[PDB]
Amino acid sequence: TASPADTNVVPAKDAPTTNSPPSTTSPNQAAADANQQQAGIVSSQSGPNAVGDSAPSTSVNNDGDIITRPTSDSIAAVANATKPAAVVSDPQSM
Amino acid sequence: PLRWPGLVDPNYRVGTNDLPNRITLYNSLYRYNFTYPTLDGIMYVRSA
Amino acid sequence: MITIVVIPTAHFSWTDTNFLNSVDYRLTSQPKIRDRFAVYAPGWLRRQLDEFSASLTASELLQALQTIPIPVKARCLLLPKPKRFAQWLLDVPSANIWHIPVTTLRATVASKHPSSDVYNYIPDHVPPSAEFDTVTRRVAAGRDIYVRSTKVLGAPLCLAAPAKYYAGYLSTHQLDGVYPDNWAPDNFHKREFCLTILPSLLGPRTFLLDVDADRDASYPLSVLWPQLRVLALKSRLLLPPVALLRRVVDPGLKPTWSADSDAAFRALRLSRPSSASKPTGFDFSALP
Amino acid sequence: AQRQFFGLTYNFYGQPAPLFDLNDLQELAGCYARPWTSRFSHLAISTGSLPVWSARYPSVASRNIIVNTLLGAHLNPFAGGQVTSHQGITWRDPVLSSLAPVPAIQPPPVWAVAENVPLDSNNYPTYVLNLSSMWPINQDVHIMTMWALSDQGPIYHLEVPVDPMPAATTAALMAYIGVPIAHLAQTAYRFAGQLPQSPDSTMVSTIRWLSAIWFGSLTGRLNRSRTCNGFYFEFAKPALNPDQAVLKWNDGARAAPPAAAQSSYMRCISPHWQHQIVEVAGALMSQSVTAVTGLPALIDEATLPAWSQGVANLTGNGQGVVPCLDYNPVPMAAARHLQWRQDGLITAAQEAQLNNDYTAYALTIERHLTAMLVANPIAAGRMPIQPFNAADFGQAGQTAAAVALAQAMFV
Amino acid sequence: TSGRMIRAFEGRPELLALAYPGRAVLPTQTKNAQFLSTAIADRIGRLDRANLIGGEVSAMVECMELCDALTLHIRETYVMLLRSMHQDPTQIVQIVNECANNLLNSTIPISLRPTILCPWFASSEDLRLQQVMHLVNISSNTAAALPL
Amino acid sequence: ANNLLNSTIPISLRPTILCPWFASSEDLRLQQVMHLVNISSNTAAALPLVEALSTLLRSVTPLVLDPTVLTNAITTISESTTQTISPISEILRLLQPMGNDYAAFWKCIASWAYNGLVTTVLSEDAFPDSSQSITHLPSMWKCLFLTLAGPMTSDPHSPVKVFMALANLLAQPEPIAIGVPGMHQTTPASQFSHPGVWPPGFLNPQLINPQQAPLLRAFAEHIRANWPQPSEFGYGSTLQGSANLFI
Amino acid sequence: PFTRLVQNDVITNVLVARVDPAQRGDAAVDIRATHATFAAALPVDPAAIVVAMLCGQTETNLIPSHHYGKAFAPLFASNAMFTRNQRAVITREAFVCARSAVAQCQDAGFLVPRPLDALRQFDVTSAAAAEIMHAVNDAFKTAFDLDGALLDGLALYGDPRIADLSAAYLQYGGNVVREHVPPGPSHIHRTLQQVESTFMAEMNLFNVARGNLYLVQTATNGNWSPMAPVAAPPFVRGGPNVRVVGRF
């Protein structure tokens, strides 16, 4: 009778962007389409509402850039690109 | 330095060059993020 | 589930164990890679295309096919001739789901010229005086369709009734051809990517695979290649095959975020560790 | 469409002949090509990408100025009804498709030189009879006239109706959100240029609104805080390069429509415009509207150079006369910054900083131009930059009135 | 440097070394060092970004890096050309409707479309020129007309 | 319970007692907005709320849906012959039983309680082809259904869309002028949406000449006169936070 | 509010503002604005609706009191009514703390006390802020053993450098109605401020030291208390004959 599943419905974790497919071309439109198809709506019934919409995607950075890996790794990548040797061997060292 | 006023000139103003007479190597520029939608992406076509 | 529409190249291997291999065998090198793809491309559809190829222009064929959803849930249900078909609704009375009158049924049994009345007013009945697109439009609805001819396109075609009515009305090889469709369905799965020979509306989640080689001249849909290619070209939707190996898809070579330096990319490392004791200890007709 | 136009050729600054070089013609209008839509072919998003800093054409406006001077030597049919030749060059055909050297067998009459020549379409009947193909001339002649009428900055027109924007414009603008002003100006020029259009067309209203919004944001009345139907322009930092602006759409409170329809003519009163892309783009964009719809009313003669006094069909001093305002960018910038502080977008400390930066930026422009003029004295026979005096950079003009208009324009 | 944000080429580290000379390390006073040591601190990385919608790509971004002027002038011109043949949806949908003699009337939604680009158009002169060119590349006998 | 129930709950009152079950209105309002952040524009994660509420409604309501009487009324007036391919075919196609438990009906009611987060709209396929004529009987019956079902949807543009559907079928016999640039009487009805494109004649029916377009004028006046008036009512308990944002 | 036929009162958009637009660094408007309708669209078939309208019946002995009383009782056996309150309270505390943390990291922003401002920290861009918020959001979820979203959306998209949430809807008449939701009296944040304040005085207890570092070569033979020298420092930055190394 008093089914909790019908009373305690709340958005799941990572809800706003979970369905976003991994792509770089048009992530927001692609994510929007994925949400629409995931929700069970078919394009033939949504009509004109499906053409211009866009939704948040994981491929888009908070700054508004196309990202292909977690931002920490991007930070790690640039950091690792610059690591001069701590101790070097040269004849004139005192 | 004349090849690199944007990199070393204190007086360098953004948006300047000396193109017809000399080529600089380090400058400022814009970059774009266009998208190329299909026709149906632009407008609701009359399906079927 | 991003979809990639595929048009086979000049000598595309078809009898291969997996259609996937003929696309690019590097995709089979890693388990971590091959698990990301579905294929679809069923045989029944292949046979239908083989037949209709001689009867539709490229534009018509593309226009007809482009709307079909990925897993075809519908079926074409062939009806037997009225004299034969009418007996079915009395052999099992509950099978008269349209509840055609018993009097009309046995009037048909009595008549020298059994009319189309038994077909008449049956919802979604497709008479021989119909066209290809009529079927395809109903295919988008997913429900099964009742037809009066074998030459149909878009959905697996199976008998509506037991074979006894169609026997005599049809011949052995004809009666044979529908057997896989009589128990057609198989499931389709939600992986990252799904290849398909079925065309579709090119868009943000659908891509055209570019292999840079001439099409299979014998393959019936090769005529669609120019129109598809130009539409993809004008919207930057082509995918070089190497792009498939990356973790995330992008049309391009030498991307910034990836050095593309991995054993998966190196096609020279052809390896065959697995086995299945299959008769093809080797298939010396398939050449990488 | 619009079957008639009026025009006025340039003025010679005491020089005896039109100020352009044969090379300029061969460069800017040669190749036997059609010259009638080339005004944007040599413009780009910003000065950083353009060869405006040295040699010939060493200014943003230089090329268009030379174009206007060039046309002044060949628009005789709209003044005397006949095609003529000047320095051995003339039109190839009565349609004025392109220029070429004169034939050797039957040369046309040689043009007698003059300046500030009034122009009527009716003087050349073949134009109307071939309106469908000769349409582009209408735009360019109008543009040339709008520049010739004024020293310093060119003149353009503004207006705002009492009604809200139609949906069509709303949809159109929602597609041009992230576009810089320069690209927008090209489309407006491209639109009205290539084929006749009626004034009751969606694009015409669209561009009309753009000019209004641009000015409103330029005065700083339209901001992130206060917008026209959600739209407003954003200007780049003066600390790097303020000569850039893009469109934006926002949640901000929408400004109310004016109590009555507002309109006026505008121009920049200071020489800075010659090397400032936002001014050039804004003027060309606005002038495009008047090109397709014609002049709504005669321009007030009260604050114009001597040759502009009482030009037929263009200037007047009677009752049916629209005033023309003018401004200097530096005081305008100060006003814009002040409005931002009052709207609360910035602090007083920042406002002082912004004024210092913009003034420093403008100083370079003045310094560059003034050095460029002595490098190209007008006595040399060609005018790459319009002449001026040092004091011209200090004029405040009617700037106070200008911001007052925006005050009344976006209530 | 902490004070700037730069492009992480992220897979071409050798390329990154070339892109931003200002980020060098200078142990000894060599001729290269004598020059690089004069570099201004902040003339590097992203200068300004046009950010329109949260959780959405920035339409365009301005930065400074290793880039010659001449190539810059070319590519900026090329983009300018592309813009010259782009039009907004309202024009596009109207064109289609008129092409069909106002049959098949259709319209567009009303919402933000940030970064679209549809270089699909040209002037009549272009069309006139192409038509003439097309007429030049045929045998003027019946062979030309029949397919049409 | 709106005093449909009366209850008693005894409890002992010890000095040291804790029942952490209270929250202020500000907390609820803040929580509600946070949901909007988490949902973003993802329609998929918004649907379940309407689904759950509709499920509860069905489990609770005393109303019973049964088309048997309607069937009998139809079948006797119709000839019910497996003939009359005229819309007797059509309406029968919609009359025949559905195993969906009329979920669409309940979804509309549920969506009312969550409008502004999700809106029910008439399905695109339900409209007739805007190029079709009024004489095509199945199209006429479609417009009848749309007009009947209009007020049930939460879409604010349903009135206009309903009106335009009939206007489309009457394009030829009733050529009215639509004072919206970029639109035409033949434009698909489902496309209108945004308020800026509401036809002025729909805004003011007096712009339609009765002798020239009688049916359209009557239809507009009928809509403007009979479309229901919204109302409001209280809920909850004053002893708790409200969680309402706008209302 | 439903609007019926009043055109000037029709709603065009419903948007969530992380920062009041006058204070926003850039437009960064809600993604929802890209959609044709102000809310998610759910297509429905009119025919099914019509059928339900036309055939509605009741049982033969429907006593409204008996039916409703029997129907409503099971619902009140739930505890959702209270979990709603509890989750809301936790959400407030997490929100206030998370906002405070990000504000303290960026060089300027939402007005919060800054006891740790003396510590070195590069100014955080939006991407970095997402990392910080993710850490805070995960910490709370682990601490209170919750499941669901909590603050997920703030970090996953948009600018995490939020100031004060508010919602608004826009009418076709140009009027906009905005509702702010400033958090009520928080508790955890108050004591956290105390923790930071006292840390700035007791950092030594956390194996962290303040001040500079000398490197004089001392070859003594007696006592040595480097963590608290008693002798005068050898020199300082402004001292005579003291050179400062160049940038490289």
mmCIF file of N, CA and C in Angstrom, chain B:
data_model
loop_
_atom_site.group_PDB
_atom_site.id
_atom_site.type_symbol
_atom_site.label_atom_id
_atom_site.label_comp_id
_atom_site.label_asym_id
_atom_site.label_seq_id
_atom_site.Cartn_x
_atom_site.Cartn_y
_atom_site.Cartn_z
ATOM 1 N N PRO B 1 64.555 41.774 -30.640
ATOM 2 C CA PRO B 1 63.245 41.960 -30.006
ATOM 3 C C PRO B 1 62.162 42.340 -30.992
ATOM 4 N N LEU B 2 62.533 42.913 -32.137
ATOM 5 C CA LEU B 2 61.533 43.416 -33.069
ATOM 6 C C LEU B 2 60.611 42.312 -33.553
ATOM 7 N N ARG B 3 61.088 41.072 -33.570
ATOM 8 C CA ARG B 3 60.195 39.967 -33.875
ATOM 9 C C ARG B 3 59.205 39.693 -32.757
ATOM 10 N N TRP B 4 59.435 40.227 -31.559
ATOM 11 C CA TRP B 4 58.615 39.845 -30.418
ATOM 12 C C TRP B 4 58.177 41.007 -29.540
ATOM 13 N N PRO B 5 57.659 42.107 -30.086
ATOM 14 C CA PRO B 5 57.212 43.184 -29.195
ATOM 15 C C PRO B 5 56.120 42.739 -28.251
ATOM 16 N N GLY B 6 55.229 41.860 -28.703
ATOM 17 C CA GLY B 6 54.181 41.376 -27.827
ATOM 18 C C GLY B 6 54.716 40.606 -26.640
ATOM 19 N N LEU B 7 55.911 40.038 -26.771
ATOM 20 C CA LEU B 7 56.481 39.252 -25.690
ATOM 21 C C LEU B 7 57.374 40.066 -24.769
ATOM 22 N N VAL B 8 58.049 41.090 -25.285
ATOM 23 C CA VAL B 8 59.042 41.799 -24.483
ATOM 24 C C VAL B 8 58.825 43.300 -24.423
ATOM 25 N N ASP B 9 58.106 43.918 -25.351
ATOM 26 C CA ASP B 9 57.977 45.369 -25.335
ATOM 27 C C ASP B 9 57.040 45.799 -24.215
ATOM 28 N N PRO B 10 57.493 46.629 -23.275
ATOM 29 C CA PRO B 10 56.564 47.167 -22.275
ATOM 30 C C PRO B 10 55.450 47.991 -22.885
ATOM 31 N N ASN B 11 55.711 48.666 -23.995
ATOM 32 C CA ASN B 11 54.735 49.555 -24.605
ATOM 33 C C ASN B 11 53.829 48.852 -25.600
ATOM 34 N N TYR B 12 53.974 47.543 -25.767
ATOM 35 C CA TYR B 12 53.142 46.823 -26.716
ATOM 36 C C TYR B 12 51.676 46.939 -26.334
ATOM 37 N N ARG B 13 50.868 47.439 -27.257
ATOM 38 C CA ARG B 13 49.424 47.474 -27.094
ATOM 39 C C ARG B 13 48.821 46.303 -27.851
ATOM 40 N N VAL B 14 47.878 45.610 -27.212
ATOM 41 C CA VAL B 14 47.208 44.498 -27.867
ATOM 42 C C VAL B 14 46.495 44.998 -29.112
ATOM 43 N N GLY B 15 46.556 44.209 -30.177
ATOM 44 C CA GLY B 15 45.890 44.563 -31.410
ATOM 45 C C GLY B 15 46.735 45.319 -32.404
ATOM 46 N N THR B 16 48.053 45.309 -32.247
ATOM 47 C CA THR B 16 48.947 46.034 -33.132
ATOM 48 C C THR B 16 49.864 45.063 -33.859
ATOM 49 N N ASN B 17 50.380 45.516 -34.997
ATOM 50 C CA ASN B 17 51.355 44.760 -35.766
ATOM 51 C C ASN B 17 52.018 45.710 -36.750
ATOM 52 N N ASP B 18 52.985 45.182 -37.489
ATOM 53 C CA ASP B 18 53.645 45.903 -38.574
ATOM 54 C C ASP B 18 53.701 45.022 -39.807
ATOM 55 N N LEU B 19 52.553 44.434 -40.136
ATOM 56 C CA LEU B 19 52.489 43.346 -41.109
ATOM 57 C C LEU B 19 53.119 43.662 -42.458
ATOM 58 N N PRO B 20 52.826 44.783 -43.119
ATOM 59 C CA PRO B 20 53.370 44.977 -44.470
ATOM 60 C C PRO B 20 54.881 45.084 -44.511
ATOM 61 N N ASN B 21 55.536 45.330 -43.384
ATOM 62 C CA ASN B 21 56.975 45.546 -43.372
ATOM 63 C C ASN B 21 57.754 44.507 -42.588
ATOM 64 N N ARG B 22 57.153 43.876 -41.586
ATOM 65 C CA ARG B 22 57.876 42.917 -40.766
ATOM 66 C C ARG B 22 56.886 41.933 -40.175
ATOM 67 N N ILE B 23 57.335 40.698 -39.998
ATOM 68 C CA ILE B 23 56.514 39.640 -39.430
ATOM 69 C C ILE B 23 56.924 39.435 -37.982
ATOM 70 N N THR B 24 55.976 39.604 -37.071
ATOM 71 C CA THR B 24 56.183 39.212 -35.688
ATOM 72 C C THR B 24 55.743 37.768 -35.500
ATOM 73 N N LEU B 25 56.267 37.139 -34.455
ATOM 74 C CA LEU B 25 56.074 35.714 -34.251
ATOM 75 C C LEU B 25 55.184 35.376 -33.068
ATOM 76 N N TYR B 26 54.933 36.322 -32.171
ATOM 77 C CA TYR B 26 54.215 36.059 -30.932
ATOM 78 C C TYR B 26 53.156 37.136 -30.772
ATOM 79 N N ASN B 27 51.890 36.760 -30.913
ATOM 80 C CA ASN B 27 50.819 37.740 -30.973
ATOM 81 C C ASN B 27 49.585 37.195 -30.273
ATOM 82 N N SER B 28 48.569 38.043 -30.179
ATOM 83 C CA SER B 28 47.290 37.682 -29.590
ATOM 84 C C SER B 28 46.274 37.406 -30.688
ATOM 85 N N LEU B 29 45.340 36.508 -30.398
ATOM 86 C CA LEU B 29 44.382 36.085 -31.407
ATOM 87 C C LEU B 29 43.157 35.504 -30.721
ATOM 88 N N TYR B 30 42.094 35.365 -31.500
ATOM 89 C CA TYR B 30 40.864 34.732 -31.055
ATOM 90 C C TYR B 30 40.819 33.287 -31.528
ATOM 91 N N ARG B 31 40.045 32.478 -30.811
ATOM 92 C CA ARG B 31 39.765 31.111 -31.213
ATOM 93 C C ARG B 31 38.274 30.854 -31.074
ATOM 94 N N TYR B 32 37.735 30.031 -31.963
ATOM 95 C CA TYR B 32 36.295 29.887 -32.107
ATOM 96 C C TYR B 32 35.839 28.485 -31.734
ATOM 97 N N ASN B 33 34.540 28.368 -31.479
ATOM 98 C CA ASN B 33 33.904 27.105 -31.128
ATOM 99 C C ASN B 33 32.586 26.951 -31.877
ATOM 100 N N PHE B 34 32.621 27.154 -33.187
ATOM 101 C CA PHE B 34 31.399 27.066 -33.969
ATOM 102 C C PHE B 34 30.831 25.653 -33.943
ATOM 103 N N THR B 35 29.553 25.559 -34.280
ATOM 104 C CA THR B 35 28.868 24.294 -34.466
ATOM 105 C C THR B 35 28.126 24.349 -35.790
ATOM 106 N N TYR B 36 28.004 23.201 -36.450
ATOM 107 C CA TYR B 36 27.546 23.129 -37.832
ATOM 108 C C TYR B 36 26.304 22.251 -37.878
ATOM 109 N N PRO B 37 25.163 22.778 -37.459
ATOM 110 C CA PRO B 37 23.956 21.959 -37.390
ATOM 111 C C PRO B 37 23.435 21.608 -38.770
ATOM 112 N N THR B 38 22.736 20.482 -38.834
ATOM 113 C CA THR B 38 22.029 20.102 -40.040
ATOM 114 C C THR B 38 20.744 20.910 -40.171
ATOM 115 N N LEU B 39 20.074 20.742 -41.311
ATOM 116 C CA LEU B 39 18.865 21.509 -41.578
ATOM 117 C C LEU B 39 17.819 21.282 -40.498
ATOM 118 N N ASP B 40 17.533 20.017 -40.190
ATOM 119 C CA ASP B 40 16.554 19.720 -39.153
ATOM 120 C C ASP B 40 16.995 20.256 -37.802
ATOM 121 N N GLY B 41 18.303 20.343 -37.567
ATOM 122 C CA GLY B 41 18.767 20.990 -36.358
ATOM 123 C C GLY B 41 18.440 22.464 -36.314
ATOM 124 N N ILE B 42 18.273 23.088 -37.476
ATOM 125 C CA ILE B 42 17.940 24.504 -37.520
ATOM 126 C C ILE B 42 16.445 24.709 -37.351
ATOM 127 N N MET B 43 15.647 23.954 -38.095
ATOM 128 C CA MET B 43 14.209 24.148 -38.136
ATOM 129 C C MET B 43 13.519 22.800 -38.076
ATOM 130 N N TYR B 44 12.261 22.815 -37.653
ATOM 131 C CA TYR B 44 11.479 21.588 -37.598
ATOM 132 C C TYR B 44 11.008 21.255 -39.004
ATOM 133 N N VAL B 45 11.647 20.264 -39.621
ATOM 134 C CA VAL B 45 11.235 19.846 -40.949
ATOM 135 C C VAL B 45 9.895 19.124 -40.875
ATOM 136 N N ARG B 46 9.210 19.078 -42.011
ATOM 137 C CA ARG B 46 7.902 18.436 -42.098
ATOM 138 C C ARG B 46 8.121 16.945 -42.303
ATOM 139 N N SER B 47 8.247 16.221 -41.195
ATOM 140 C CA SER B 47 8.562 14.804 -41.251
ATOM 141 C C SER B 47 7.416 14.011 -41.871
ATOM 142 N N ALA B 48 7.784 12.972 -42.619
ATOM 143 C CA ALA B 48 6.840 12.031 -43.223
ATOM 144 C C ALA B 48 5.832 12.704 -44.154
#
